[PDB]
Design an enzyme around this catalytic site. Structure first.
Site, PDB file in Angstrom:
ATOM      1  N   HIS A 177      16.491  16.888  27.265  1.00 53.74           N
ATOM      2  CA  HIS A 177      17.760  16.191  27.099  1.00 53.74           C
ATOM      3  C   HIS A 177      18.512  16.613  25.847  1.00 53.74           C
ATOM      4  CE1 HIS A 177      15.306  13.552  29.704  1.00 53.74           C
ATOM      5  NE2 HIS A 177      16.458  13.310  30.305  1.00 53.74           N
ATOM      6  N   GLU A 225      13.538   4.594  43.617  1.00 53.26           N
ATOM      7  CA  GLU A 225      14.622   5.432  44.105  1.00 53.26           C
ATOM      8  C   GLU A 225      15.320   4.849  45.326  1.00 53.26           C
ATOM      9  OE1 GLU A 225      15.245   9.028  42.542  1.00 53.26           O
ATOM     10  OE2 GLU A 225      14.733   7.379  41.185  1.00 53.26           O
TER      11      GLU A 225
END
Length: 597
Positions: free
Chosen positions: A487, A357
């Site tokens: 998703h 990240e």
């Protein structure tokens, strides 16, 4: 006094008005994630609807500007993504139906509860609940119950809503001058007007199904090995000629396959790699983990992060007084403000997550000069592709030894590298055919290759064709098994999780050859070599301003997307599997089924 100058001034007014409201709308979102409160749940809603109205009104006022008489490719790139009517082409009643279906899909999936009417103790949540029993259970029926029953209360109530979704999104896309919504989703990779680099939406399948044609070998030995060695786990249920049950793939569905490693270790007597026992002894915290991760990027030449980044990012759970959903996310608030959200803990996986990240944050830092529409990746699978290559260099034992965490005299042999390769490939390749089969099914149903009466039959056929997974129990048309994934339920694009990996190895190979590494690719490191970091930054600084083929060319040198770096990276593991699978059944036969009695 012409179209090209009027478009530029309009874009100036737009960007000088989009930036400041985007900051205001994202600040409320960040404040809600930090502070899950009723006062905040409405603030981000007001802010997001303001920006939703803003983008619609600017899309309407941009619609009198034709694309045929503007020549500047930069202005054309801004205009093509802003001209998109999207939901504007449908009627008010259809828009209402689609948005209620949207907030129903998410609601049912998020609030799906499993329980046993005969046994009260068999009632559990999802996180850290339902996935846990699908995570660390060694019994067949233990996983079976919450596999079939998971789709019993949510896998039935989304079939008709998704049937209506398919037909309303068909008109969502066709009215916008597309063939199907599968053709709308493959529109990011489309490149037109760039001579020699022009990429059409129809070539995406031609390239993906060709790249999979070289990935199929490695995966079939992976499947053969796993099926050979799980008979030590489930000898009385699974055939070593057929395929694997779905409930034993590591999760409720089987996207990630990290969960199999603890049962599928190659060598057990060896000591697996970990510093989790090393930061506890040496007093590392969330501050120091980030500070050492910063040196990784500083060594390759990337600039130091902003002072406000540290004073605005959220690093450690603010106790019980305030409840914050702390999924690992990187936040680019703009105006030079960027933050990161994660409930940091002292473990090596949190170090890899911090690097993963942190790469996102540095990458977003690169294209600050790009306009507010070009402040995004060239392709969708490109943003998560620049962020994992740090993680691949963050797990190398060479990297950990130079920072004083790992023991200076840890012996590295052919049994340690190979287990590292199994840990990574079982995680990064065990996901590629599943992403590809899913998006392929979405594309043949969204183009309408299937009627209603075999909606899911030709779904389990391609699981049994691509990834080779059999169902423990047959499924009739009534349910909706594909919709169970988040998703699918919230209807995102997934092929970003197949294409990101294939960018990852291309970038890693090109980068650590530019760093002049001598040896196999699976350990090469990128730190302490600015000649590769500068090459990478000259790519990150373009973002969406250039076509993704040219972006791939400026680093790897190929307008095409390749698997050769993948086969180099897993060649040593490939070699292990060849002489390890001399007696196993390489391949699968479709006639097998556990219920074929």
């Amino acid at each position: 006094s012409t179209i090209e100058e009027q478009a530029k001034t309009f874009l100036d007014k737009f960007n000088h008005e989009a930036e400041d409201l985007f900051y205001q709308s994202s600040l409320a979102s960040w404040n809600y994630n930090t502070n899950i409160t009723e006062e905040n749940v409405q603030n981000m809603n007001n802010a997001g609807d303001k920006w939703s109205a803003f983008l619609k009104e600017q899309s309407t006022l941009a619609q009198m500007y034709p694309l045929q008489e503007i020549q500047n490719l930069t202005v054309k790139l801004q205009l093509q993504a802003l001209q998109q009517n999207g939901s504007s082409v449908l009627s008010e009643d259809k828009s209402k139906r689609l948005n209620t279906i949207l907030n129903t899909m998410s609601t049912i999936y998020s609030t799906g509860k499993v329980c046993n009417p005969d046994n009260p103790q068999e009632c559990l949540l999802l996180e850290p609940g339902l996935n846990e029993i699908m995570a660390n259970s060694l019994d067949y029926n233990e996983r079976l119950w919450a596999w079939e029953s998971w789709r019993s209360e949510v896998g039935k109530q989304l079939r008709p809503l998704y049937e209506e979704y398919v037909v309303l999104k068909n008109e969502m896309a066709r009215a916008n001058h597309y063939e199907d919504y599968g053709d709308y989703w493959r529109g990011d990779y489309e490149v037109n007007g760039v001579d020699g680099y022009d990429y059409s939406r129809g070539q995406l399948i031609e390239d993906v199904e060709h790249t999979f044609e070289e990935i199929k070998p490695l995966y079939e030995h992976l499947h053969a090995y796993v099926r050979a060695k799980l008979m030590n786990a489930y000898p009385s249920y699974i055939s070593p000629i057929g395929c694997l049950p779905a409930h034993l793939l590591g999760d409720m569905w089987g996207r990630f396959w990290t969960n199999l490693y603890s049962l599928t270790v190659p060598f057990g007597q060896k000591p697996n790699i970990d510093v989790t026992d090393a930061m506890v002894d040496q007093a590392w915290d969330a501050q120091r983990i980030f500070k050492e991760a910063e040196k990784f990027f500083v060594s390759v030449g990337l600039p130091n992060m902003t002072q406000g980044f540290w004073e605005n990012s959220m690093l450690t759970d603010p106790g019980n007084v305030q409840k914050a959903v702390c999924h690992p996310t990187a936040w680019d608030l703009g105006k030079g403000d960027f933050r990161i959200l994660m409930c940091t803990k002292v473990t090596m996986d949190d170090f890899l997550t911090a690097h993963h990240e942190m790469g996102h944050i540095q990458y977003d830092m690169a294209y600050a000069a790009q306009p507010f529409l070009l402040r995004n990746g060239a392709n969708e699978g490109f943003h998560e592709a620049v962020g994992e290559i740090m993680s691949l260099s963050a797990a190398t034992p060479k990297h950990l030894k130079s920072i004083g965490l790992l023991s200076p005299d840890f012996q590295e042999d052919n049994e340690t590298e190979i287990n590292f390769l199994l840990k990574q490939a079982l995680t990064i390749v065990g996901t590629l055919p599943f992403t590809y089969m899913l998006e392929k099914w979405r594309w043949m149903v969204f183009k309408g290759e299937i009627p209603k009466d075999q909606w899911m039959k030709k779904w389990w056929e391609m699981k049994r064709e691509i990834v080779g997974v059999v169902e423990p129990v047959p499924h009739d048309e009534t349910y909706c098994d594909p919709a169970s994934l988040f998703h699918v339920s919230n209807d995102y694009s997934f092929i970003r999780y197949y294409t990101r990996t294939l960018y990852q190895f291309q970038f890693q190979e090109a980068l650590c050859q530019a760093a002049k590494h001598e040896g196999p690719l699976h350990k090469c490191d990128i730190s302490n070599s600015t000649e590769a970091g500068q090459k990478l930054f000259n790519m990150l600084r373009l973002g969406k301003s250039e076509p993704w083929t040219l972006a791939l060319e400026n680093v790897v040198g190929a307008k095409n997307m390749n698997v050769r770096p993948l086969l180099n990276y897993f060649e040593p593991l490939f070699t292990w599997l060849k002489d390890q699978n001399k007696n196993s059944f390489v391949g699968w036969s479709t006639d097998w089924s556990p219920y074929a009695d």
